[PDB]
């Protein structure tokens, strides 16, 4: 297919043609509302390899975020404590902005289940993404096997809990020695290993 | 149990056995290991020397079992034999036939030279021995097999 040529073109984000396209598209999306249904994706290849299939039930919404550090919501720097919790400006929010965006559209429209999201465009001021949704009420979904796992009540709001790509990434899930803390659940680990376990015949 | 404990025997003796003057207050002299340079220096020194300091080299991600080298001496060396067969080989004392001894399967990783063993020639399968151990075996007429 041609999706491969499309990928390989995408992965050169500094060519003049992409510079142009980027400028047009970012201006367009910036004129648009912060959240808007898109008729169809801007990177169909990307959506397709993250599981989009052009059919009755799948949806794209495009999204903006506001792109900076997360200034502490504290009146005038009045944090009321020790110097270490005295910072406000240079603080970073642990969830990604992609995660935020996904969360915000999932809140906008709650009948649907998220699947994934992806970068499209940005500037200094904003970041733009395109986000993938499903109506699990849809008969097409429920009758196709291959996705209907998402119809399950378990996968409700899987962006809200940290179960997408970005979710599982920021939540520290990956194998190995650099993830010993927070691989199978941070709080789970800490709880496990701050618990005192005591048997009947004491060991 | 409780009933053996002195607090049943203190009942009535005001100031259960902690005194009236120097009374049993909360945490004097601080908590835990507070004062090891200031007002508990004399217990730190005298009964806990060396506590304060850095020394030596670090080793990040020390995995023991790199250094698994459990240890054995000629002094024992023989309990490895099942006792029923032990005296038989011991009475034999032949170079044409000596018992094979796998320390590693027994759970040992190095052999040392304590003790005096008989003059029996004996066969060993052992990694990591000491010069003196190998020597006494050779004087007994035995040999050694280095292994992996």
């Amino acid at each position: 297919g041609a999706y491969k040529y499309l990928e390989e073109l995408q992965r050169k984000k500094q060519s003049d043609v992409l510079r142009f396209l980027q400028r047009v598209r970012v201006w367009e999306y910036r004129q648009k509302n912060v959240i808007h249904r898109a008729a169809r994706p801007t990177r169909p290849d990307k959506a397709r390899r993250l599981g989009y299939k052009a059919k009755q039930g799948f949806v794209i919404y495009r999204v903006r975020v506001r792109r900076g550090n997360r200034k502490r919501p504290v009146p005038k720097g009045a944090t009321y404590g020790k110097p270490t919790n005295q910072g406000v400006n240079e603080l970073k929010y642990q969830r990604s902005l992609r995660a935020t965006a996904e969360e915000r559209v999932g809140r906008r429209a709650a009948n649907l289940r998220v699947l994934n999201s992806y970068w499209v465009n940005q500037d200094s001021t904003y970041k733009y993404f395109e986000v993938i949704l499903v109506d699990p009420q849809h008969k097409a979904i429920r009758r196709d096997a291959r996705y209907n796992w998402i119809c399950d009540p378990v996968h409700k709001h899987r962006e809200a809990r940290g179960l997408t790509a970005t979710g599982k990434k920021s939540r520290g899930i990956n194998k190995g020695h650099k993830f010993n803390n927070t691989k199978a659940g941070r709080r789970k680990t800490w709880k496990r290993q701050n618990t005192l376990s005591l048997w009947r015949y004491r060991k | 149990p409780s009933r053996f404990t002195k607090t049943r025997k203190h009942r009535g003796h005001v100031s259960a056995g902690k005194g009236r003057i120097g009374k049993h207050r909360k945490h004097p002299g601080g908590r835990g290991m507070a004062g090891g340079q200031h007002h508990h220096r004399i217990n730190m020194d005298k009964y806990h020397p060396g506590y304060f300091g850095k020394v030596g080299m670090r080793y990040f991600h020390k995995q023991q079992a790199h250094f698994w080298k459990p240890v054995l001496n000629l002094d024992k060396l023989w309990t490895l034999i099942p006792e029923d067969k032990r005296d038989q080989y011991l009475k034999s004392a032949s170079k044409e036939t000596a018992p094979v001894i796998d320390t590693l399967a027994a759970g040992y990783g190095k052999i040392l030279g304590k003790g005096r063993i008989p003059n029996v020639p004996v066969i060993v399968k052992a990694r990591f021995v000491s010069k003196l151990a190998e020597e006494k075996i050779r004087a007994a007429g035995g040999v050694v097999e280095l292994i992996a």
Partner: protein
Amino acid sequence: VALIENKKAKLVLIANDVDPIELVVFLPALCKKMGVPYAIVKGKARLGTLVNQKTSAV
């Protein structure tokens, strides 16, 4: 596209009005490489009608 890479193509037609345009932009160069006769055209809607479809893009 596979037909082109296989040089099965005798002629190619490419409507100009696409979005995402990246679906299409490289195709002229490809047809140049494979020596294929190609052309840019107008009315992918007309192409759809040529397919018994709404829209064709090629």
